[PDB]
Amino acid sequence: SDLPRHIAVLCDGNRRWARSAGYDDVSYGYRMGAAKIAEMLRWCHEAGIELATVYLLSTENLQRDPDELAALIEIITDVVEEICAPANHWSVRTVGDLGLIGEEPARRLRGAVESTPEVASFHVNVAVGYGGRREIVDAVRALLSKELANGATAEELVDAVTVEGISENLYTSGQPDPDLVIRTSGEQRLSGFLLWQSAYSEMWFTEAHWPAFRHVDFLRALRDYSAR
Template sequence: MIENLFKIPEHVAIIMDGNGRWAKMRGLDRVYGHREGVKTVERTIKFAKKVGIKYITLFAFSTENWQRPIEEVNAIMQLLVEYIHEKLPFLKENDIKLLFMGRKEGLWDSVLEAMKKAEDETKNCSSLIVIIGLNYSGKAEIVDAVNKILKSNVEKIDEESFRNYLYLPEIPDPDLLIRTSGEKRISNFILWQLAYTELYFTDVLWPDFDEEEFLKALYDYQSRDRRFGRV
């Protein structure tokens, strides 16, 4: 029950894995799994806002995902554009800000236009901030940060100043990372920011991830003793 939650993470990151396997288990095309996954995104965002989470980061498309069949890549991009345009009124009505992180090179013009529209129209929203990792790679983010530093002619960099060169330096590091589908790896996702993040893995495939499963992750999180290197 939600009433039993007493320690809510400020920032939850999610690797949304298992759409293709979910569809294959049902004899359906992988694209159908991605469509069901989009429905899960919506209910996950609603639940995050309901319990008081302030930031939620969703890994939607990695730089490695370009290696998938072109039909699947095209379907994912089209789904993203459709979702943004369809759900933008909902986001604004519920005071939800939408941000994107990742490299823009290679993305469709229609995707870039939808991203800009969403960020512009939700920039004053603040009750929940949703970050979408799109064409994203943790290694690429660090490399891009280093290249920015080289161009800036800064004489000295420490950990705090380094984060100023990341894609979204103003966003706090995740308290909790959830990965669905049973895989137990972080797959090149926000590598710098995950240094002290609590990790939670579930066998549930992303389209089946519901409020009950989210609660299980939150209950597990509130049982952790986060010492950050201290005794």
């Protein structure tokens, strides 16, 4: 009630944090961000949040220097393997397109996520190779494919698309929409993250870069959410 069912987190500021700290290698920032993802998910679970979505890799991110992108993707893969650790008993789902990150990372991520239970008290979505407008397009495509496979005419395809039909074909099919979306780094935008799903979400902003995010920042987010 006063607590979000589903919290979504956009983890901005990793490179800026590394520069501010005087590191020449921005992977120091991503590594600390990775540590904070692990912490944040523990906080959500213990607070009684049912589902958390973390934005690990956007389609924008994939346009980066090959070598920096490679190291980032390795960090992300370690993050997901950590999220999927058996002792957590968290149910994990990928949100996005693993066809974009390389086959070795994709195999590692898929394997980790597939090892987690379907039914659990806490669920984690890891958004990797994700874009919100793209997700909608792919939802519509999936919807139309199913209708065609079940014998729809071209004319019937034209009318088959509905709000509920799109919702049911997103990556987040069958999950509650995010109640609270957290963005860091003073960035006051959505950047298409869970675009369809977050239409009615509460937004909460901090100036802190993601690697600098603290448990008390999480407490403030929940406090503010409850107050609203």
